[PDB]
């Protein structure tokens, strides 16, 4: 409804920038510049399962250095 990211039936790329940050991108939109495609379009819960296993540097003790 309304926002294309709130669509539970939508498919989403998983993108990654130079700083190792991950962004979902809806399949129906033109891909943004500066981001690499990591995963092909998956489900809302499939993206949730991939992100929880490949992006675990998201704690305040991980921003302690760089």
């Amino acid at each position: 409804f309304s926002n294309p990211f709130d669509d539970p039936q939508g498919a989403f790329y998983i993108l990654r920038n130079a700083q190792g940050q991950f962004s979902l991108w809806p399949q129906q939109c033109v891909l943004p510049a500066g981001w690499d495609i990591v995963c092909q379009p998956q489900s809302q819960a499939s993206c949730q399962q991939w992100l929880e296993a490949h992006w675990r540097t998201l704690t305040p003790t991980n921003f302690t250095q760089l």
Binding site: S2, N3, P4, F5, Q28, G34, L51, L58, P60
Partner: protein, 1231 residues
């Protein structure tokens, strides 16, 4: 039904050539007489009177006028701007014939709108011309081509009784079922009808040749269906609505029946238009053309019929798309005929006709309401269509969702609004606070009711605690949870955590233990800072180190530790998640530094400003309350706990410290203004120099009501937690407030190094005034969600306008205003903002669907009672349950279970069980069918006044106790008016927080240490002992603490009842040596610091000498207007009576068990009659009231007397205003 509108259609045929004028006029009467529909008559009744006649048109000769054309227009306008009668048999037809030249004629024609329409009037003009031409050949008058009015009426009754009807009815019944809501190119609401028949006509020919090239690439596409596909896309894109209802011109009569009819014929019917973003222009042109074909098989159906089976409510459609062309051609021998249109009729919104010519080019005709549109903004929209077409002529494989409808001058205006680049230093919070502390080390910085720190003193305590945190294993990059009451040590703790290079995690102790443990298991902080009282709650939390911080530490220098780095996390604020579990927002160090440096640049603070700390630490608004005053030199003052909920306690708090800067939530500002009178508004809010509102939509009417009371500048700020406090700003006072047209103050312009986007579903920008999805870019974005990469990648998305950068998805719907400011419009998700509290309805539903035997559960926000809708946000959380077994659920016991999981504000106030969840034909849960909750030991005799107070505010008679204040429609804003109303009806004070913990008639009706030792302020270093006066309580020494060095402890000792030193002593030396037991045990060896006042003065001067029998030294002995007992005596009983009068007047008349107070005075009088002053050779300090011989009267009982003068009485020498001068003297003497 009702007599119709009386607006007419007007046109003139411009004839060029030799015209037989008195013959053509005679041909008009002959033509009009043939059509018996033009003899229609209204009298309510509507019928045809064939006894009506037509008069010859009056011929007018303007060839000898100074301006033949201009005068001819005025003539036709003078008849057109007159209201037609519709009454009488007066035929509603009028023709003219104005002669402009020898060869040029203006043939004016006017008809009532119920006689002809835009399609049928050329039939009458052509028949009059046929009669005219036929006579010019010498032939008789031609027959009547029109069918009589009787035959067209039976034609309609032939219909409506057939199977085509009911079949057409079933089609347009299902059409309005899936008919989307209408759209409009105007930001104004859409009215049902429209008054003015004077409209705005606009004709535009596109000579760029782009449409010609578009149709030559789409050869198989019909040009009318292609042009219509363009308009359908053009309207949806400009309104940012892919589904909208439009109108379309059909015909109720077809074939010969339409060419023969006198009119009307046209039929405007609803048309649902869906714009699929992934489609190409041919596919949209195909589906749209195939959709009209199905509608044309039912176009004979009446348009006024769709309305009847559907006043001034919203209409069915907005824009009207016309693809038809009307034949105005006449053939008069050697005469050129050109029809010019004067009056088409009223338009409600916008009519758009498209004309692809024979050569392939494209012209459009725009008709618009003059109230909703103007000349230039239509040219601007029609320019967007010119580039719309051009982008498909370049690439016909372009998707309809990716087509660009924004002009080149609006991309530039967005490049100017986001030019917020400001170079800031690569610094941290600790470096900014240490910078200001070096500037003004002696200025006042932090103060509550028992403390006042200078900047140097504050940094000494912060570094002391930050070293203690390091000694307990807090390394840079860790989290520290904080569960502290609002005091100076709450502020110190946060600064100390940042000083150690760690991030702080604020905890609301009002949350249940199951949620705090869940929050602590997700953040996993290295240490928890709390008090000893809150400690037993965290015992069930495994692997968590505790630290009790409730007293100042020993200071060891103020040098900064330099452990903080800009890349570190500054703080973690938890919010509600739509999946059930809360989520933590980690805000970086650089993100909060930019927010504060802008705050100080845009709203400068100085050393005479007083910032208030009243926002609960859980809310990220407090973040700039804890640090912004310390990067500027201002003073930060701690409000009392539970005082942010009390407007009256807020008024006392503002006047007490002279607060200059504070924050408000619009619901609280509305409740604060409701408690204000102009007398109290200048007694508390007089020192306010600037006030900030955020968290909710700020009503402009409230700001004007706030500007009249105080005149203090008000500022609207907007931003989510993920964007470091606030992301935009807008003035809510002065000239900007008077120029606000909307209901709410705009959220404004971007702060430093911050951008705003407002995009559609395909991530393209939207033109001004059009609603879109609000996104945030810049240096102020959060690092992400703690432990939640799935949430981060979903809300912190890629930014297609800044390669590689990131962009936060707010979930807010917003639009651009003409001045560049952003206006908040609403949400796009199920997140609500109740009185400033961020609440996710998804979480509350997930917890209720986990309850025992619960099949379905729905949370809903509504106003239970309309008598409580006075100001602020009156919404309540109402939960609806469906049992899986069909058995009753006992909702009150389920409500108690929810309170052990959800925060108090997220717990529904009422739980109602439903047989079936009220779905609709869609299956999408109709929330308007959700039933609002309806409004036993009868009251009492004491709770009869409070039960009468509910009936006042709640507007409903409450007669039985255990009546929940909230379940009757009350809310925490109305509890402030409730507690303020009971405080006038009871001698005892009632705080709005007492209503919170116990909201019930009988439970609210049931609702300063009394021990030997009074712990006024427990510090670290030396202890100043204050002795009780004749009342037997050291309560009045509360105001001395703030004037002392924070290391000093202050322990007042007193005499309680029963079993008290004044009640049990026969001699005054029996009690004077009884306090030597309590004083010597806590300081077995001195030195000693003693203060007395009146009876406590002689009680200290006896101990000060009983200690000089020891053994230890007496460093400070202070006496507040004390006299030796050698000075029963009268007149001193009138003085100690004034001591009893003043002491009781400061208890607010609360309480009674306090016969102890007057009892102590009675046992004090009999104790003063056997008293005897002891030597004490040392030095003592005297404070004397000038308004009542202190030297010689004390001479042989204290060798040294330093003495100080104060203009007061013996009663007011202990007053808070007198300690304003006495206070600093004790501090200066004690060191």
């Amino acid at each position: 039904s009702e007599l119709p509108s009386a607006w007419s259609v007007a046109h003139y045929v411009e004839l060029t050539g030799e015209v037989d004028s008195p013959l053509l006029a005679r041909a008009v009467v002959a033509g009009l007489a043939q059509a018996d529909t033009l003899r229609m008559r209204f009298t309510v009744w509507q019928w045809v009177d064939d006894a009506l006649t037509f008069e010859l048109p009056e011929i007018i000769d303007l060839r000898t006028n100074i301006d033949p054309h201009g005068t001819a227009q005025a003539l036709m306008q003078a008849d057109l701007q007159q209201d037609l009668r519709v009454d009488s048999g007066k035929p509603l037809v009028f023709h003219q014939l104005i002669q402009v030249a020898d060869n040029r004629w203006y043939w004016y024609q006017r008809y009532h709108h119920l006689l002809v329409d835009g399609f049928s009037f050329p039939a009458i003009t052509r028949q009059i011309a046929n009669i005219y031409c036929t006579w010019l050949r010498g032939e008789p008058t031609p027959a009547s081509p029109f069918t009589p009015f009787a035959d067209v009426v039976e034609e309609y009754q032939q219909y409506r009784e057939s199977e085509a009807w009911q079949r057409d009815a079933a089609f347009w019944a299902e059409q309005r079922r899936q008919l989307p809501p209408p759209a409009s190119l105007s930001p104004a609401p859409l009215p049902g009808r429209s008054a003015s028949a004077d409209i705005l006509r606009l004709k535009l020919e596109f000579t760029d040749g782009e449409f010609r090239q578009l149709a030559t690439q789409l050869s198989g596409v019909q040009r009318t269906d292609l042009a219509l596909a363009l308009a359908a896309l053009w309207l949806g894109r400009l309104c940012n609505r892919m589904d909208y209802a439009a109108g379309f011109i059909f015909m109720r009569r077809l074939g010969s029946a339409a060419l023969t009819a006198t009119g009307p014929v046209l039929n405007v019917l609803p048309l649902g238009i869906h714009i699929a973003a992934q489609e190409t222009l041919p596919e949209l042109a195909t589906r749209l053309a195939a959709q009209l074909k199905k509608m044309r098989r039912h176009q004979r159906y009446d348009a006024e019929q769709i309305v009847r089976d559907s006043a001034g409510d919203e209409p069915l459609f907005g824009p009207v798309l016309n693809i038809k062309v009307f034949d105005y051609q006449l053939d008069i021998p050697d005469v050129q005929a050109q029809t010019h249109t004067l009056a088409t009729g009223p338009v409600n919104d916008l009519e758009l006709a498209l004309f692809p010519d024979v050569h392939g080019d494209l012209s459009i005709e725009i008709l618009a309401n003059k109230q909703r549109y103007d000349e230039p903004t239509l040219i601007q929209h029609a320019e967007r269509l010119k580039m719309l077409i051009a982008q498909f002529a370049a690439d016909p494989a372009l998707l309809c969702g990716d087509v660009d409808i924004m002009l080149p001058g609006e991309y530039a205006q967005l490049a100017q609004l986001n030019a917020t680049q400001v170079e800031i230093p690569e610094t941290t919070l600790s470096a900014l606070v240490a910078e200001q502390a070096a500037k003004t080390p002696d200025a006042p910085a932090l103060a509550d009711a028992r403390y006042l720190f200078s900047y140097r003193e504050m940094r000494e305590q912060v570094v002391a605690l930050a070293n203690l945190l390091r000694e307990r294993g807090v390394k840079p990059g860790d989290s520290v949870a904080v569960a502290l009451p609002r005091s100076v040590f709450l502020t110190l703790a946060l600064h100390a955590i940042v000083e150690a290079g760690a991030a702080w995690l604020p905890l609301d102790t009002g949350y249940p233990d199951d949620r705090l443990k869940m929050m602590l298991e997700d953040a996993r902080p290295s240490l928890l800072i709390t008090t000893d009282d809150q400690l037993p709650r965290f015992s069930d939390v495994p692997n968590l180190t505790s630290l009790c911080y409730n007293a100042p530490l020993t200071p060891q220098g103020s040098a900064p530790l330099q452990l903080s780095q800009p890349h570190h996390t500054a703080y973690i604020i938890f919010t509600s998640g739509s999946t059930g579990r809360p989520k933590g927002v980690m805000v970086g160090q650089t993100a909060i530094v930019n927010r504060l440096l802008w705050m100080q640049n845009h709203y400068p603070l100085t050393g005479e400003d007083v910032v208030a700390q009243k926002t609960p630490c859980s809310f990220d608004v407090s973040v700039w309350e804890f640090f912004w005053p310390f990067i500027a030199g201002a003073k930060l003052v701690m409000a009392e706990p539970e005082a942010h909920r009390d407007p009256l306690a807020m008024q006392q708090f503002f006047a007490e410290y002279g607060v200059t800067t504070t924050h408000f939530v619009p619901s609280m500002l509305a409740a604060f203004v409701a408690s204000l009178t102009p007398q109290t508004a200048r007694q508390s809010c007089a020192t306010l120099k600037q006030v900030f509102c955020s968290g909710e939509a700020l009503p402009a009417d409230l700001c004007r009501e706030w500007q009249q009371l105080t005149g203090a500048p008000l500022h609207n700020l907007y931003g989510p937690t993920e964007a470091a406090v606030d992301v935009s700003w807008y003035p809510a006072f002065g000239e900007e407030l008077a120029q606000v047209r909307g209901s709410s103050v705009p959220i404004g312009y971007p702060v430093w190094n911050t951008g705003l986007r407002i995009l559609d579903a395909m991530m393209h920008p939207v033109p001004p005034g059009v609603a879109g999805d609000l996104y945030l870019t810049g240096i102020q974005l959060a690092q992400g969600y703690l432990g939640r990469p799935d949430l981060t990648a979903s809300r912190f998305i890629a930014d297609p306008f800044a390669p590689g950068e990131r962009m936060y998805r707010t979930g807010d719907v917003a639009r651009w205003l003409d001045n560049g400011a952003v206006e908040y419009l609403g949400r796009s998700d199920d997140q609500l903002k109740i009185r400033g509290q961020r609440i996710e309805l998804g979480e509350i539903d997930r917890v209720m669907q986990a309850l025992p035997d619960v099949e379905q559960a729905v949370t809903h926000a509504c106003v239970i009672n309309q008598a409580a809708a006075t100001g602020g946000d009156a919404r309540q959380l109402v939960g609806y349950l469906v049992s899986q077994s069909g058995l009753p659920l006992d909702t009150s016991a389920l409500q108690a279970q929810l309170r052990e999981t959800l925060p108090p504000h997220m717990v529904p106030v009422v739980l109602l069980q439903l047989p079936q969840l009220p779905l609709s034909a869609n299956g999408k849960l109709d929330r308007k069918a959700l039933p609002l909750p309806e409004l036993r030991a009868p009251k009492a005799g004491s709770e009869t006044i409070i039960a009468a107070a509910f009936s006042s505010l709640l507007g409903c008679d409450v007669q039985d106790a255990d009546a929940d204040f909230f379940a009757l429609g009350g809310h925490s804003l109305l509890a402030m008016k409730l507690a303020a109303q009971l405080s006038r009806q009871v001698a005892r004070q009632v705080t709005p927080g007492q209503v919170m913990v116990a909201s019930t008639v009988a439970k609210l009706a049931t609702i300063m240490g009394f021990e030997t030792i009074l712990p006024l302020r427990e510090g670290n270093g030396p202890t100043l002992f204050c002795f009780h006066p004749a009342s037997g309580f050291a309560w009045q020494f509360s105001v001395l603490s703030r004037y002392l060095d924070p290391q000093w402890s202050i322990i007042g000792i007193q005499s309680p009842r029963p079993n008290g030193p004044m009640q049990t002593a026969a001699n005054l030396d029996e009690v004077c040596e009884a306090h030597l037991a309590t004083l010597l045990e806590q300081q077995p060896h001195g030195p000693y610091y003693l203060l007395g006042y009146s009876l406590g003065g002689t009680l200290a001067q006896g101990i000060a000498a009983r200690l000089r029998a020891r053994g230890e030294q007496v460093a400070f002995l202070g006496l507040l207007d004390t006299w030796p007992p050698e000075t029963l005596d009268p007149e001193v009983l009138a003085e100690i009576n004034r001591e009893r009068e003043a002491f009781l007047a400061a208890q607010q008349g609360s309480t009674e068990l306090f016969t102890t107070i007057e009892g102590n005075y009675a046992d004090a009088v009999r104790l003063l009659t056997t008293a005897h002053s002891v030597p004490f050779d040392g030095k003592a300090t005297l404070f004397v009231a000038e308004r009542t011989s202190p030297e010689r009267a004390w001479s042989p009982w204290i060798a040294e007397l330093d003495i100080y003068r104060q203009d007061c009485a013996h009663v007011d020498i202990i007053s808070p205003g007198t300690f304003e001068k006495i206070g600093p003297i004790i501090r200066a003497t004690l060191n």
